[PDB]
Amino acid sequence: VAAAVGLAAPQXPAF
């Protein structure tokens, strides 16, 4: 569950 946040996280700034 929490894992998903970590894998997504590096892309967030582009959005």
Side-chain angles (χ1 to χ4, degrees):
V1 178
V5 171
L7 303 184
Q11 311 313 319
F15 283 75

